[PDB]
Amino acid sequence: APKAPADGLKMDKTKQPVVFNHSTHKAVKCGDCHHPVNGKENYQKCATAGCHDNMDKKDKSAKGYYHAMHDKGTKFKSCVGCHLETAGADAAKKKELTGCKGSKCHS
Ligand code: HEC
Ligand code: HEC
Ligand code: HEC
Numbered sequence: 001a002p003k004a005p006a007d008g009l010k011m012d013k014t015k016q017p018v019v020f021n022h023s024t025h026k027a028v029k030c031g032d033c034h035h036p037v038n039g040k041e042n043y044q045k046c047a048t049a050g051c052h053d054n055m056d057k058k059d060k061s062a063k064g065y066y067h068a069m070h071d072k073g074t075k076f077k078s079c080v081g082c083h084l085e086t087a088g089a090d091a092a093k094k095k096e097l098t099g100c101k102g103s104k105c106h107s
């Protein structure tokens with residue numbers, strides 16, 4: 001059994017880095033993010049080679065890193081996708097959780 005790491009993890013593959021905290025996602029099952037691949041939940045970094053390693057922000061295939069982090073209608077919920085659902089009709093929360101600028105993701 002893997003262990004949830006400590007808060008303050010940096011997602012820094014790009015020029016727009018994001019801090020991910022596990023302690024704020026306790027309500028979400030590990031497997032919802034560290035999703036099955038070949039029938040087993042995979043705990044490798046999302047951008048591991050052969051994973052979401054296409055750094056072209058325009059790509060919409062499963063390989064696209066930007067895509068996996070931001071899109072709706074994806075096989076597993078994206079950061080933004082889940083956050084949208086979470087905020088509901090609350091404009092303040094929408095800003096905080098889904099804003100492109102001045103949000104909890106991107107200052
Ligand atoms: C989505 C909301 C997540 C849930 C729920 C959990 N984790 Fe997570 N974890 C997530 C991210 C985006 C990252 C960073 C990965 C990257 O590419 O930077 C992590 C990181 C981990 C790690 C470290 C992996 C590494 O750096 O090699 C581990 C071991 C880990 N997470 C385990 C873990 C467990 C045990 C969880 C449930 C209790 C869990 N995660 C939930 C996103 C999300
Ligand atoms: C390689 C071993 C991977 C790792 C580590 C992570 N992902 Fe993944 N992801 C991978 C595949 C092969 C696929 C398709 C799975 C399938 O059954 O089709 C996915 C899919 C996604 C999706 C859906 C994309 C879409 O529908 O267009 C998302 C949103 C996603 N993956 C996100 C994600 C994140 C946040 C991860 C790190 C915590 C991560 N994946 C790890 C391969 C691999
Ligand atoms: C649902 C399946 C989620 C997914 C996938 C991810 N996040 Fe999330 N996030 C979720 C909830 C329910 C909450 C708390 C909402 C609240 O304010 O009440 C959060 C919160 C965040 C935050 C703010 C708190 C913090 O940890 O600073 C951030 C910055 C955040 N989430 C980032 C984030 C990223 C980078 C994700 C993809 C890798 C991601 N979330 C996925 C629910 C869900």
Ligand code: HEC
Pocket residue numbers: 011012013014015016017018055057066069070079080083097098099100101103104105106
């Ligand atoms: C957290 C829930 C996010 C919010 C809200 C938005 N984005 Fe994001 N973004 C997120 C992550 C996890 C990442 C990758 C971090 C890393 O560097 O590893 C990003 C990155 C970007 C980038 C960089 C793309 C590139 O140069 O490769 C861009 C341009 C970006 N994000 C744009 C963007 C927009 C337009 C958003 C509103 C719709 C937005 N982000 C919100 C997570 C989060």
